[PDB]
Amino acid sequence: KETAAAKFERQHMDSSTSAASSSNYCNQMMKSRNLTKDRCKPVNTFVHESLADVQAVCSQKNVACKNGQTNCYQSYSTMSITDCRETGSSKYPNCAYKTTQANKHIIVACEGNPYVPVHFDASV
């Protein structure tokens, strides 16, 4: 079945663009990455960086995850990210989102060997 590492790439990586190019980014990306298949996922963050740069976070500043877990890491530098948040008109299967683009630090949880990001925790 899809690995946690793969799933992380599928849900949160967008190395193909430097930023969201329009208000529709979320709507299109959420659908294409299959995040709306079973239900409308309420929030999602896409990271506009190379895989290598994001995998490197696992070796940066160790911080506690929102749930208390201790395998989270915060990026030393800001990163280009797009936040997607479901809108008040969103209604499965027609999931709808608001697109917000920014440059922020990312916090990820890492696991495995190679030790890579498997969950997106927050941006700061």
Side-chain angles (χ1 to χ4, degrees), residues 28-122:
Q28 276 140 10
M29 285 295 291
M30 301 286 294
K31 171 131 217 63
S32 72
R33 296 300 195 69
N34 226 35
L35 318 176
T36 71
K37 197 185 180 62
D38 291 313
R39 75 192 228 270
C40 313
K41 164 171 176 179
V43 310
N44 192 60
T45 313
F46 286 105
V47 188
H48 298 288
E49 305 291 341
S50 57
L51 289 173
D53 281 4
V54 172
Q55 284 167 357
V57 175
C58 293
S59 80
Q60 292 175 16
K61 188 53 182 198
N62 192 207
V63 308
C65 306
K66 286 173 171 176
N67 77 342
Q69 286 174 213
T70 240
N71 58 326
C72 274
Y73 298 82
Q74 184 172 305
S75 65
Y76 293 138
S77 80
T78 53
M79 296 187 172
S80 167
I81 61 162
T82 299
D83 277 341
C84 302
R85 190 108 51 185
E86 194 177 16
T87 212
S89 280
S90 186
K91 184 212 186 45
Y92 185 83
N94 301 303
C95 302
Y97 296 84
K98 177 174 158 166
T99 305
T100 309
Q101 170 68 41
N103 306 86
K104 296 199 324 173
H105 292 91
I106 60 162
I107 298 177
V108 292
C110 316
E111 298 172 14
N113 166 256
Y115 192 55
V116 300
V118 290
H119 158 87
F120 189 95
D121 211 52

Side-chain angles (χ1 to χ4, degrees), residues 12-18 25 33 47-52 54:
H12 306 286
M13 284 307 298
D14 188 8
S15 306
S16 85
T17 71
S18 78
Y25 178 95
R33 296 300 195 69
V47 188
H48 298 288
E49 305 291 341
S50 57
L51 289 173
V54 172

